[PDB]
Structure formats: C-alpha cells, structure tokens
Design a protein around this ligand. Structure first.
Ligand SMILES: CN(C)CCc1cn(Cc2ccc(C(=O)NO)cc2)c2ccccc12
Ligand SMILES: [K+]
Ligand SMILES: [K+]
Ligand SMILES: [Zn+2]
Length: 631
C-alpha cells in the first residue's frame, strides 16, 4: 500500500566548508549539495517527492556506531577556532572540521534515520537523502575521508534495533571503499555489505589490504562482506552491469533482504576527477532499478561522494527518476566487461563460492546530456476477455479505431484468408495498444489476453517491427514453436520451455527441470543469462508471451525486464487466469513486488545454464564472468 518517494534535504548541511589550504580536501564543497537539489528542482523531480524534514541524530543514536570518546571529542569542535580545528583535523586522514560540521553531521545522520523511518513505516515506498558530510569512511572512533559519522551504518543499526530486521543489504556504489561500513558489520551476517571501488592493486586511497576481494568478513559474518576492486580506471556501463549481473544481484536475491540501503556516491560516474571511471549518469537509473524488486521496494538511497558538479546533478536525477518509477533510459553500446573487470569479477566469485549458491557450482570529460524521462500519461493498458471488469490501479486503463479496424482487415485478407473467432478483436487490441506505446508516447506498456497464439504473436511481432521497432526482444513461456524469425538480427528469442531443445546465437532456450527448485533456477537464469543478453541486445520493445500450459517468478521478470526498451513491454497471456493477469498488470504498472524469500537449484539446471553461457558469450560478451582464454 506504500506509495511515493521521500526526498530529505536541508540547506543547513551546505553551511560548513574547508577553511584552510588542503588540496586533498578542497574538492568537498557545499555546492555539491546545492547543485544536486537544484538539478532535482529543474527537472521537476523534487516537486514530485515527499519532503521529509531533517532532524538531529540523538547522542544515544550516535552511540549505536561510535564510541563515547570519539563523540565527546567531535562535540568540542563547535567551540574551536581555525587553528584548533586544523590541529584537530590532522589527527585523522583526509578530513577537515568546521565550527558547524558537528551540527551538520548530526543532521546528515538524522536525515538518514528520517528516511529509514518513513520507508519502514510505509509512509513512502523509497527515498533519497541529500546529505553532507558523507558517512561511509567514518569509523567507531575516527573521522576519515570527509566523513564524521557513518550515516549508512547508523541506518542499518537503527533499522535492526527499532524494526527488528534480520537481513539488511547495503550497496556501496561510491568509487571509494566504504571501509567504515565494512569494519562495522565485519562479523555481522544480518547486514550484507557490497562495495565496488577504485583499488588499482591497493595503490588507490584508502590503500587497504582489506578492500580486496579476499575480505569476505569474519566469524559468523564470513561471506557477508563482498568487495569488488577496480584495478584500472575507465570502467564503463558494461563493467558496472557485469558486476551487478554476475556478483551483486545473484547474492542479493538469495539473501532476500528486508531493507536495502544504498551508499550512493556518484564519483563513480564519468567526468568525476576522483573516480576517473566512464559510466554514464544513465547507468544509475538501472543500478537503482535492478535493486527495486528487493525488499518490496523498500530502498533508502543516501548520498556519499561525487565531485564533478555537472556529472553530479545528472546522476542524482537518474536515481530519483527510477525511485519515482519513471521509465529507464536505453543503454546502447554494451558488451563484454574489460579484462581487468573480469579478473576482479572472477576472483570475487571464486572466493565467495563457498558461501553463495549461485557461485557454488565452480568450487567442484565531456558526455552527451541524458534524455528526458517523462512518465507515460497512463502507464499500463489492460485488455481482459470480453466482458471482464477488474479492479485496476490508478495508473492503468482498459483498451478500437476505424483506421485500426481497416488494418486488421488488410492483415486477414493477406495472411489468414480463412479466419473469422473474436480473435479479430484481440488483433485490433494488440495494434491499438502498440500504437499508443510506440508512437503516441501516451501509454508505456500493456497486457492483452488472447485465444489463438500464432495469429496474435505473428501480428504483434510484425506490427511492432514497422512501428518502427529496430529490435524486438521476445520472452516466451511455453514448449511450442512460434512464428518468430531470428535470422536478421532484429529479434532475439528467450524461451522458457519444458521440452529439451537451439543452434544459433539469437535464441536462448531454457529447459528447467520441473520441481521445487524451479524458482531458484529461473532467478539464476534471469540475472545471469537473460538480463545480460537483453541489455546488450538493447531492444526497442519487449514481447512477453505465456501459453496456457509454476510462475511465482513472473512478477520479478516483468519488473526487471522493464529496464529494456524504455519499459515498453507488451505481454500476451493465452487464456484467462485472474491471478496471473493481476500480477502481470501489477508489475507492469510499477507496483512493488512481493519478495521470493527462500531452495537451491538443481545442478542439471546449473550445468544447462552454463552450457548456454559457453555457447552464447562469444557473441554476447556481457554474459562473461571470467577472463577470456587467449589462443
Ligand atoms: C586531486 N584528486 C585527483 C585527488 C585528491 C585527493 C583526495 N583525497 C581524499 C578523498 C577522500 C574521500 C573521497 C570520497 O569520495 N569518499 O567517498 C574522495 C577523496 C585523497 C587521498 C589521497 C591522495 C589524494 C587525494
Ligand atoms: K564503494
Ligand atoms: K557484514
Ligand atoms: Zn567516494
């Protein structure tokens, strides 16, 4: 029932700054905050957010994660002059203090707690806090790397204590390692910490052996710390998405968190003078979107770093766009991760393979401005069988024009001479829905219930190609063979079937053993095969097809597959099924997805899937999770 996105912000956190010469520190400026909020305002996103106010973290709250001694020290800095503040600043690494920073640090922390409470109370679905100072470097008794108190560590400790959560996921996509967070939960299996970071074989700050992939946690916490070191600069969209598909997401969906907190540093985006990576701001729309099916969408995004004032606003906007449910922008030019990324990916997977099921099987600048992302007028159109009313969410709608009807006549009087049930109606619905999706910019996606599969599939696919749709991704659940030509490179077919068998690289056929393991195997294939191929293909439309002949998984796929084609997906359900039609519509409309919870996949399925990767990854490089064997 939760709706809306929170945006926690306050101009007071911009009212402390660096007061002496320090080339390391001078990058951390108030304008980082003012530029990010103003960019949200300009694109109309802040106005669409629930503005929860900041508060101070209390002393007892600060003590959840920091020592009394350290608090008492920081608590004296408001009374210090500049010389005393400089002298106190030098007790720590890469951090400066100011007369007002203790105030601002309590506000940065309290804002984070406000965001946790609004999400966990169901007052909003998700949200973002724009805070200074950042948090993820700060430690139990030390300020570090512009950080005073550990905002995101607070949040998970506070969520644990006050909502009795057993499993919290922290995703730290800042370009620096959040070592403060690692230490905090080093031994804690209830908080899973994932971080990627510029490492360069430990030569990049903070220069820690424990930022490497071999730090999997300690004690009961082994396997709940996941470090992915970047050992070269210039990482791209493809490296970031490879990290999610082949490390983070497989673990995240098996973990099944009850809350997601994001250390959202954007110094990992192109143009940042500190990260020196090359991922576009648009990628953050997808990093955000790929995590939203977790924890019924309960996601708290907390600003960490980001220093190119221009790159910064754009990446903040893409994140909030996705939190609000706006359609994701198309990512073009995707392919294999670079060799350094695949080495890091391969290494982290191997060492984590003793702890996680998905990996367990191999223990045996200038850039173009992002487009506009307006949500469609109505998001989802539904076409149930004739004379079936259904309770539809507020952003959905039922379906047939004269021109449209003339076209159905032309298609019958050419390709189906002898056809006369109410199929002609479904064909007119397919065409009119597609026309509103592709050309009209009015609706986003839709679902139509159909009788005859061949004529509707053929006519949906063919009509989509001439919209025009450069490329069409087809996802079909059924053991038949469809009127789909995968020979010109304009179509890629994914088939989830029961029969045993493909011989070309434009079809992925998944024959999952029937049983209780069907759900884990499906999610394994979704994250590690279907999504990487689909993202590289970069379709202009997704065509989902379900034949009337075990799909507690369909909602997740519908949700994740809307990362492609700007969310333009048309689903054909053969035969009426109230439940499946309602779940399809609900996921299509942007509703939150119910968690899967917990049963490991059959090795027959794992072996079947790895044969598919071996067969496809030379053509679709985003499938790779090992370095290529060189001849
Ligand atoms: C001029 N540039 C190229 C480097 C200047 C420079 C900043 N720091 C500190 C620092 C701390 C935290 C974050 C962050 O974003 N955390 O999330 C970013 C930087 C250094 C440390 C060691 C050597 C150089 C530097
Ligand atoms: K990080
Ligand atoms: K941990
Ligand atoms: Zn950083």
């Amino acid at each position: 029932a939760a709706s809306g996105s929170a945006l926690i912000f306050d101009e007071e956190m911009s009212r402390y700054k660096l007061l002496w010469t320090d080339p390391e520190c001078e990058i951390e400026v108030p304008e980082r905050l003012t530029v990010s909020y103003e960019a949200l305002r300009t694109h109309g996103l802040a106005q669409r957010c629930k503005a929860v106010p900041v508060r101070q973290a209390t002393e007892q709250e600060i003590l959840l994660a920091h020592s009394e001694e350290y608090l008492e020290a920081v608590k004296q800095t408001p009374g210090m002059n500049v010389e005393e503040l400089m002298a106190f600043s030098k007790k720590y690494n890469a951090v400066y203090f100011h007369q007002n920073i203790y105030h601002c640090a309590k506000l940065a922390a309290g804002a984070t707690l406000q965001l946790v409470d609004s999400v966990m109370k169901r007052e909003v679905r998700n949200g973002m806090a724009l805070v200074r100072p950042p948090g993820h470097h700060s430690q139990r008794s030390a300020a570090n790397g512009f950080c005073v108190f550990n905002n995101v560590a607070f949040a998970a400790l506070y969520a644990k204590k006050n909502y009795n959560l057993n499993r919290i996921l922290i995703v730290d996509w800042d370009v620096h390692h959040g070592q403060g967070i690692q230490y905090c939960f080093e031994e804690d299996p209830s908080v899973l910490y994932f971080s990627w970071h510029r490492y360069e074989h430990q030569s990049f700050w903070p220069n820690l052996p424990e930022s490497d992939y071999s730090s999997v946690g300690k004690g009961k916490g082994s396997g709940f710390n996941i470090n992915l070191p970047w050992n070269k600069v210039g990482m791209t969209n493809s490296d970031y998405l490879a990290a999610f598909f082949h490390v983070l997401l497989p673990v995240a969906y098996e973990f099944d968190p009850e809350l997601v907190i994001v250390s959202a540093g954007f110094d990992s985006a192109i143009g940042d003078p500190e990260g020196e990576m090359c991922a576009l701001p648009e990628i953050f729309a997808h990093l955000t979107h790929l995590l939203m099916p977790l924890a019924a969408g309960k996601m708290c995004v907390v600003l960490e770093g980001g220093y190119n004032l221009t790159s910064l606003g754009q990446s903040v906007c893409q994140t909030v766009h996705s939190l609000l449910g706006d359609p994701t922008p198309r990512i073009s030019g995707l392919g294999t991760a670079c060799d350094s990324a695949l080495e890091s990916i391969q290494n982290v997977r191997n060492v984590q393979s003793s702890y996680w099921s998905s990996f367990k099987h191999l223990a045996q600048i200038v850039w173009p401005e992002p487009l506009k992302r307006m949500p469609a007028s109505v998001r989802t159109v539904v076409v149930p069988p004739p004379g079936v009313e259904l309770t539809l969410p507020k952003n959905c709608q039922h379906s047939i024009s004269e021109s449209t009807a003339k076209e159905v006549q032309r298609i019958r009087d050419k390709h189906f001479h002898d056809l006369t049930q109410n199929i002609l109606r479904s064909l007119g619905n397919i065409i009119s829905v597609l026309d509103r999706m592709m050309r009209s910019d009015e609706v986003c996606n839709g679902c139509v219930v159909v009788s005859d599969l061949s004529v509707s599939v053929q006519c949906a696919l063919q009509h989509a190609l001439t919209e025009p749709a450069e490329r069409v991704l087809v996802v079909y659940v059924g053991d038949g063979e469809l009127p789909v030509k995968t020979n010109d490179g304009k179509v890629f077919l994914v088939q989830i079937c029961t029969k045993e068998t493909d011989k070309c690289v434009n079809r992925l056929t998944l024959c999952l053993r029937e049983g209780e393991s069907l759900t884990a195997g499906f999610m394994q294939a979704l994250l590690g095969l279907i999504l990487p191929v689909a993202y590289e293909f970069n379709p202009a439309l997704v065509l989902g097809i379900v034949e009337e002949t075990l799909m507690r998984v369909w909602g997740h796929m519908t949700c994740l597959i809307q990362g492609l084609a700007r969310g333009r997906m048309l689903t054909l359900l053969q035969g009426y099924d109230k439940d499946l039609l309602e779940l399809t519509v609900s996921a299509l409309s942007g509703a939150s997805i119910s968690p899967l919870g917990p049963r490991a996949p059959k090795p027959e399925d794992v072996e079947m899937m790895e044969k598919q990767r071996q067969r496809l990854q030379e053509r679709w490089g985003l499938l790779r999770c090992t370095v290529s064997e060189s001849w």
